[PDB]
Design a protein around this ligand. Structure first.
Ligand SMILES: CC(C)CCC[C@@H](C)[C@H]1CC[C@H]2[C@@H]3CC=C4C[C@@H](OC(=O)CCC(=O)O)CC[C@]4(C)[C@H]3CC[C@]12C
Ligand SMILES: CCCCCCCCCCCCCCCC
Length: 31
């Protein structure tokens, strides 16, 4: 499964992680 895990890190994964980081930061600021 590890090769699939490696390919997951390429499927525009960094942009999705960046977006979720930004949105969760905004959620932190919205409390
Ligand atoms: C470049 C980076 C470092 C700056 C990114 C900006 C955001 C981190 C900040 C800027 C202004 C902030 C907003 C300022 C005030 C509010 C109102 C706040 O409360 C409400 O929705 C009011 C309604 C209610 O009181 O029921 C929700 C979060 C929000 C949009 C904040 C969310 C976080 C924001 C977008
Ligand atoms: C090119 C990309 C620049 C993006 C700048 C903002 C990155 C996300 C920050 C969210 C939390 C802010 C402290």
């Amino acid at each position: 499964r590890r090769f699939c895990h490696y390919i997951v890190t390429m499927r525009y994964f960094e942009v999705v992680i960046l977006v979720v980081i930004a949105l969760s930061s905004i959620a932190l600021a919205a409390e």
